Structure formats: C-alpha cells, structure tokens
From Swiss-Prot:
UniProt lineage: Eukaryota, Fungi, Dikarya, Ascomycota, Pezizomycotina
Disulfide pattern: 34-123, 178-249
UniProt: Ca(2+) 2 binding residues: 16, 260
Reaction equations catalysed: Hydrolysis of keratin, and of other proteins with subtilisin-like specificity. Hydrolyzes peptide amides
GO BP terms, alphabetized: proteolysis
Residue numbers binding Ca(2+) 1: 175, 177, 200
Family: Belongs to the peptidase S8 family.
Peptidase S8 domain span: 7-279
GO cellular component, one term: extracellular region
Residues of the active site: 39 (charge relay system), 69 (charge relay system), 224 (charge relay system)
Transmembrane segments: none
Protein's recorded name: Proteinase K
Cofactor binding: number and manner: Binds 2 calcium ions per subunit.
Annotated keywords: Calcium, Disulfide bond, Hydrolase, Metal-binding, Protease, Serine protease, Signal, Zymogen
Length: 279
C-alpha cells in the first residue's frame, strides 16, 4: 500500500532517505494487534479512528480527553490518515489529567492495569503500550514499566524533552523498555530531544501532524510524537509476524536506518525507525 502526501514522519519511516512524501506499508496495517495509549485519554469518536479506538480505564472523574495530547499520540499510532498502523485496535488509559499532568502513583497504576487488562482482550498479533510521558528519575516508575514489559507487552516510552541525558528521567531510564528519541524532517536530532546510552531508537518528533480533540487535527513536537511512531511500527511488525513483544525493540534497532542523523552525541545510538517495506 501507498499513502501519497503523507505526514513527513510516516513517509520517513518507510524510506532510507529523508525528503519523501509517500508512506509505503504492507496493507495488513497492524490488524489483529492492540496498542494501549497511556496518556490524557482518546477522543474515540474522532472519525479518524473509524471505531477502532475505545477508552478502557480512567483515573479521573471522566474518561474524556480534555487536553488533546493523548488523542494526538493515538492518532500517530493508528488513525486512518496520521497513523503508522492503520488497522490496529486502540485502547485508552487516562493516567494524565486534562492539563497533561499526573502523579507517579497513578501512572504506575495505569501500567499495572494494562498488564492485567490485556488478558481480557482479543489481540492475537500481540500487545503494545505507548507512554508519551515522564518526569524525574523514579525506581518505582521504572519498575512498573519493567513489569509491563515482562508481562508480554511491547513498552515504548518517550526519552523526554530536556536536551539532556535520559538517565535522569523515568520511565525513560528503565533499560528493559524501548526508549525513543525524536528527530526532525532534515534528519537532525530534535533540538529538545533527550539522548544517552539508554536510548534504543529515534522516531520522527518535530512538526508531527495528527488527530486532536473536537474532531480536529494539529501539528505539535516532542519525543512523545516519536514514541507512537515506534509503538505503531512495533504493532505493524508484530502483525506481520517478524517479531514479538519481547523482541520488537531490538528488531526495530536491528533493522533501523543507521547513521542518518546529525547532532547525535557520542554514545547515543544513531538509529532511525524504519519498516523496511519491500512491495
Ligand atoms: Ca540513509
Ligand atoms: Ca532499552
């Protein structure tokens, strides 16, 4: 399949080179996989989700996404126009309030929820969790991410937007998950992207068009706009049978575009998520 005039990030993950406009992908499109978006929620009614999104848990008074952040991230995973995995099932877990903030205890609960809840769901191609969030280092938060991974979920987390070593941020610094940095359309490390030895992979994160609340769309930037690219790619590869929840981050790194990025500090991987699609 080919989506012409795709958002640059989708085009980028299906090319060995920057500057293309077409997103090439296998038409299976992550069908039969499930991605939990742990965030501010998902506006499941957005036409772009085609009924494939639903809220499954909230830690606040409502399950509504009153911010937009979670809806944007979910859109990059699996919306029709803006998504990597256009036929995946999306599950919303609202651990962040409508200002985009959340307590560590709640974020941990949300992770533990997904580890259990997946057993109530029909996801024959496997399960992914996308965590576009984080704060300062916490062993408790890291441990929760490690548990979720261990339970058989592909966990992808944002590296953070501090232009610093991700070792001092959680869940970014948990080694056993997939820690995602951000790049821009000219293959530069995004100016804000964290870096460091803990990063597994980079994804498109600067000027990312996706879904927004009120049935709208907008372009925003962050390591968290890169995280769902990798989560969606994982789901896509899992549907294809190329890899598993336990091994997908490694597989993505194995098959990444190598050395294409600039302003990568010594000691940080120079690896850009790539679907290696051959028609
Ligand atoms: Ca290249
Ligand atoms: Ca890792």
């Amino acid at each position: 399949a080919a989506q012409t005039n795709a958002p640059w990030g989708l085009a980028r993950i299906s090319s060995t080179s920057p500057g293309t406009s077409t997103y090439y992908y296998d038409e299976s499109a992550g069908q039969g996989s499930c991605v939990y978006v742990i965030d501010t929620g998902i506006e499941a009614s957005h036409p772009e989700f085609e009924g494939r999104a639903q809220m499954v848990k909230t830690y606040y008074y409502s399950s509504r996404d009153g911010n937009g952040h979670g809806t944007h991230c979910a859109g990059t995973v699996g919306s029709r126009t803006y998504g990597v995995a256009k036929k995946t099932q999306l599950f919303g877990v609202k651990v962040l309030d409508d200002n985009g903030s959340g307590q560590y205890s709640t974020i941990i609960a949300g992770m533990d929820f997904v580890a259990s809840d997946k057993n109530n769901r029909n996801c024959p191609k496997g399960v992914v969790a996308s965590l576009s969030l984080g704060g300062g280092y916490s062993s408790s938060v890291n441990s929760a991410a490690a548990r979720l991974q261990s339970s058989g979920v592909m966990v992808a987390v944002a590296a953070g937007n501090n232009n610093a070593d991700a070792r001092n941020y959680s869940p970014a610094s948990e080694p056993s998950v997939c820690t995602v940095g951000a790049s821009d359309r000219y293959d530069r490390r995004s100016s804000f992207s964290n870096y460091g030895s803990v990063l597994d992979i980079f994804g498109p994160g600067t000027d990312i068009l996706s879904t927004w609340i009120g049935g709208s769309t907008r372009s925003i930037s962050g390591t968290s706009m890169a995280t769902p690219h990798v989560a969606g790619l994982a789901a896509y590869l899992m549907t294809l049978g190329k890899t598993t929840a336990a091994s997908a981050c490694r597989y993505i790194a194995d098959t990444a575009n190598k050395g294409d990025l600039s302003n990568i500090p010594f000691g940080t991987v120079n690896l850009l998520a790539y679907n290696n699609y051959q028609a």
